[PDB]
Amino acid sequence: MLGILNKMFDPTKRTLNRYEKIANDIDAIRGDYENLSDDALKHKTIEFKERLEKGATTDDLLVEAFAVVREASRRVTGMFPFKVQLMGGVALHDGNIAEMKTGEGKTLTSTLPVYLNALTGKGVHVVTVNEYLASRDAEQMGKIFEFLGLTVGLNLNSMSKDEKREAYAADITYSTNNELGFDYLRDNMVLYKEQMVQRPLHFAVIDQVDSILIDEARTPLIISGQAAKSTKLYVQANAFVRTLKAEKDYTYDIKTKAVQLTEEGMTKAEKAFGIDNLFDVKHVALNHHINQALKAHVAMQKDVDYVVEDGQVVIVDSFTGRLMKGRRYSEGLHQAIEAKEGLEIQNESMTLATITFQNYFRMYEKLAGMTGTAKTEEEEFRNIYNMQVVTIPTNRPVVRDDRPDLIYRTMEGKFKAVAEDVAQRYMTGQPVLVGTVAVETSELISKLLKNKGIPHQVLNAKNHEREAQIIEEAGQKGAVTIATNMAGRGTDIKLGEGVKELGGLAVVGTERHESRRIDNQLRGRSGRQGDPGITQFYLSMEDELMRRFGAERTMAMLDRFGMDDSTPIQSKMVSRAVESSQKRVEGNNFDSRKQLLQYDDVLRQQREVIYKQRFEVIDSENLREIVENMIKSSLERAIAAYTPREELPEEWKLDGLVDLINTTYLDEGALEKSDIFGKEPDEMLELIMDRIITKYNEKEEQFGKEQMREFEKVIVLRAVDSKWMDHIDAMDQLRQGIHLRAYAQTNPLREYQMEGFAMFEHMIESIEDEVAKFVMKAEIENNLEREEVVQGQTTAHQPQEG
Template sequence: MMGIGTLAKKVFGSPNDRKVKATRPIVEKINSLEPDFRALDDAGLKAKTTEFRERLAKGESLDSLLPEAFANAREAARRTLGLRPFDVQLMGGIFLHQGNIAEMKTGEGKTLMATLPVYLNALTGRGVHVVTVNDYLAKRDADWMSLVYHALGLTVGVVVPGMEESEKKVAYDSDITYATNNELGFDYLRDNMKSDLAQVLQRDHYFAIVDEVDSILIDEARTPLIISGPSQDRSELYIAIDKLIPELTTEHYDLDEKQRSTTLTEAGNEYVEVRLRQMGHLAHDTTLYDPESTNIVHHVNQALRAHVLFHRDKDYIVRNGEVMLIDEFTGRMMQGRRLSDGLHQAIEAKENVSIRPENVTLASVTFQNYFRLYDKLGGMTGTAATEADEFFEIYKLGVVEVPTNKPVIRKDNDDQVFRTAREKYEAIVVEIKRAHEAGQPILVGTTSIEKSEALSEMLKAAKVPHNVLNARYHEQEAGIVAEAGVAGAVTIATNMAGRGTDIQLGGNVDMRVVSELERAEKEGRQADPAAVRERIETEVAAEKARVLDAGGLYVLATERHESRRIDNQLRGRSGRQGDPGRTNFYLSLEDDLMRIFGSDRLDSMLSKLGMKEGEAIIHPWVNKALEKAQGKVEARNFEIRKNLLKYDDVMNDQRKAIFAQRREIMESQDLSEVTGDMRRQVVDDLVAEHVPARAYADQWDIDGLTTRGREIFGLDLPFREWADEEGVDDTDIRERTNEAVDRLMAEKEARYGEPTMRAVEKQVLLQTIDQNWREHLVTLEHLRSVVGFRGYAQRDPLNEYKSEGFQLFEGLLNRLRSEVTRLLAHVQVMTQDEQQAMIAEMQARAQAQAEAQATVQQGALAAAQASVQNRVPEMAGGAAAPTYAPGIDPADPGTWGASGRNDPCPCGSGKKYKHCHGRV
């Protein structure tokens, strides 16, 4: 019987169908305009851009311009790239412009699709950011798509690590900027540490399109971006603690693989305490539970995590003496990323490489809060539907599934589950060999470098030629992926998210042409590019026919990832643009996901069924069970991210307030009113603290007021005399103090000049804000690490964090006022005359020192010459021959006596004694 929901869908269509349907009239309008735009010459396309901008300036909306702008961009793509966006790409472009995520299958042309909404939104002149997962894709996409944008009269920039600030500034000032999520986030933080508006790089957060949106906004959003500075070096302690951890056995700690956590047991605590006392790191009268042991306990916990939870060639690799983290979702090295809280240092100690000091946070932001800065956000990926709720809840992004250009005819087989990993891998090797011999290209997905290399060894033993693509060899990835569709090719890949290169059946013509021409150039041969391309196109077409006959690309996964999206990304490599293909997942009960999520019951059930060695269970129910397990993991990860965000939202409100204040200060030319208000507030607080309202004069703290007045303003004010006057109250004290402080600042301004004081006020404000904000971040970090324990007292940790965080922020603002006022009251600025006088004095002092030094050197030279003349009379031929005082034998050091360090050596070598026999 058909369910009500299913019946309603049949009648009304799903919400996704309705969204797709709504775009059809717009697509038809764009198509109807195509002949008009084809009739334009190249200059006409650029002229259209100018016309659109003028119409926008007159008040026309982007939505009304959309059909014409898309038609113009489509024509530019056709002329420059030879690619005409399909109707489904126009649909995807419309969804992106509306601030949605367009889910499009692999090979449907997401990179080209993005040019349409990018062009439309760039017409505003506010700048559009296209965000990619790595530098290679940022550069590649910018180079490739810039042909389209330049034909339309727009400027394109690309931001990658290691660029000069001036180059980045040009890139951000372009109409369209390609960059990675990391660079955008870090540049945002750096901009908010600058002290001059001219140095700020990012001009606006208007519209961003995020490629591989699930990878960036979900997978990478678990850890915030942090700009940090070095703290004290504790390398010796890390090394010492690291030597202790391998002594521990499984009875000394508990391991929770689901939560990725590990803690010492009671036995472990006792053992560690004894060993730390023996090593001299714990006093004999101290236990690990004492407050003073907090630091050592933290080091032990991090070392334990490094050994038990982090595995080489899975979570990180060691390259050139450096521990490089690996992104579990993309299998890539995360250049420059380090684990915080001393965990990275613990791994460095474990791997016996150089330990870099821990860092203190100078600025931080989560990806969630960075991307929520944009007025409008769009995203594209092959797999987003499974995380639609999270995208909407956190980013207010809808997910729309865009239909494929051609129907998908790929066969997705049910999972095959083996009892042991050995049986599974043996079956995999047999299957790979069979596909290879049949001429079918096969892409093998693994979950770690270690497993990809173990499988590679098995294939070598079976004499199956293959390529391995993982974090070790990611430099060659584009070439390996491009050739993965050749008949009989075997490619082993860790993860296929965000590779950005399509696997084309028969091979990639463009890449082959480039490599052929490069080879000819190296060998000094002349090659005709057109002839080379024609030959390669013929070869690839014949190769493609062979592959299609063999069944298209075969994707074989060796394990299920804990996220279904990663599995779907791998699956989506096959069956692009209506090509045939098939996918298969080979699993065993010893796989991490199966083992952690209750394979015991399944194992006993399979035993009862009497499964033989090498047999697999294949049933849709198994797929359903695995999907549920993956759903549980994804739900848990969502909770972790949501929790991180709730805490970061507290800091984010404060961050935005501080950054907005900094921006206002940098943009202002005159801050005297701001500093004046701060000064009066400080005086109010000071008087209120020491002279309570409606209190008698003998209850006033005059000594405290005098001391604090001297500390803050540098003034000895006659508070005692004022207090002895008849009828003086707290209001009079406040007014007189304000008058005295205002007079002091007016005198400074008269002496140094107004422009100088305005510049000083700006610098003092910015530096004080930065210093106090950094200290505030450290305090919030410490509060965040301990506030969880409030839960034991039946108090909500998040509410506690909010209220205490707010109190800390109020304290920060009070400190800012007080410190800015104190610094400005004490500041001494040199006038131009004083600067000149100081420079002249320094020059005179330097000259006097130089003359004195020259006199000493001349005296020493004369003495040395006299000494040499006494010892070395001239020989007949004009050369000097050594002569020695009576009783000195140059061959017998015992006769030399005490020689001066700078005297010639008595051995007759001609060198000074300190450089010869007197050398230490």
């Protein structure tokens, strides 16, 4: 765009001057492989690998790497990529959104960077919108990879707990946006390291970037499993404890705990009727379920800590004592009070793990994608994925008829014109693609021409193979196809035999979409490789989008000027209007996702903290450093809670502390006032620990030298997992709670952060506390297997919208 306003195309100009050159270097060395045996070529792949760990960077081999591919494809598929293709390739390697007009060869272009990167067995994921496309792709573009001697694994949800590891092992993997996503999640529920399917996320290449990264990313991904019909044992806990109140179950107010060790009259009473002798196994199920109820009676008082109404037990802040915005007590204490207050114990289906697509594709060390429409939603990327959109030239200059919209006053009147258009287009033998927006509108224009005497076929998503198949012959002489919302993305329409002369593929848009791209993709279904074609979008004045944009004035002045009598009518101050209005829709959808990501952004600061810590455990040589560290961690909090800010120097309730450490870490009569009397908190913490460790040793010596590990791993998993799943649900709960009652000075997103982080902190401290206890007071029996933390059926799904 010549003129002062040209400094905007500058950020991409120097980048296009580059890529165009790089592409010249590849075509410059097209001899080094032109006449060379398959063997040596195939061996070039290794010469490369060898050069890599020998100092060279992936970039250093780009020119050649590509060259070899460009060559290999001519052999495998008879296709020698065009400079543009080579250009798109480089872009993809640089980690950008390569926008190449729908009709070039992205599936091929992708081979270049996916290869140059895959040359280090670190993993390369090529993600597609659906399993079919992803399948087909892998097979066809695979031969190229296999030829250069590279393993290519496919990844579908139908593959086994064994197949998928292999598929992910290959140095080049094919999958869908969901599969890769859900796996990441299932990989963090794993009880045994080897159950993890994925490898560390390296480099991703997204085909149809818009669909996957934007559209399909409006809602989050999540796994969950209903809660057992066990609304039987919760009350039992309440009924049991409702008859224990005494100093036979020691309470606590400095640390607010209803511990249980020297409460033998209780730990024995707990055994009213169950496997009394055994602890470890069904004690983690009871204790963790009983204490939460015990604390519901002795610790949590009624109209002071929480409030009750004809709804659920609402919480109450200390300061302004205001009613919390839909929040519950974690670790499963909330529904323990519901038993206490009798109120209906609301049992639901809690969440297990979750992440936003936005956050997923940000994990891979490097990310990139290809499509023919990105500029539309260009700032979305740069902002959320720090990716730039580089628009790559077209193999051959475009000479297609992008006819201006034709506005109509009568809705059911325009269709008569559209239906007629296809009619004559057809009669001349020229092909036609009538794009619609809704099924109701596509079937209407369907029967609308049935009575017109024209053969046709609608596009249903019965299976993308079925759609794809139709599209194939969508450029032949009798062509008349009805595509709902672009039923075939990947499968490109090849002009029919003779169509070149009759004119081209006449694509006619029924209505107009909300975002320019969805119809820019349609409008682009013609003009492949300089092919001649005609696109025309018909637009009504009753079109739901007109009513959505508030174009009532324009609807008036149009009836005030006897216009509704002259069927067709073109106008700038209406088409340049329907676009500016679309931008507003595109600007809102972006605000949404940006609003969505920010909330998840809180979880993603939490997930990693638990995931790295969970994985670290799942896969570890020695686990004592972990477990111990957590203990000393739970001990500081304990000691510290008994030594507030100079409240009576050596006159703290020391005699009490000893009673806590004894019946929580050591044994009924271990620590003595004397052992603490006089030393500062620093010394104390160290001292109390020295006996915790010297005691911890007896465990490795007594019950097992290495059987200990398997003993630790189970309690740290049945803990970390038990709580986490609970917390993840609490977050995916209060997020919607706050949305309502919220007239606080700050904004809701902030409170989420605020209160959220606090919650996250209570769980961590809880995780530690529980861990520190069992590793000590829990003696091993027979069954020493890491036990799951959720009953049977667990589902994988992504919300439709909301």
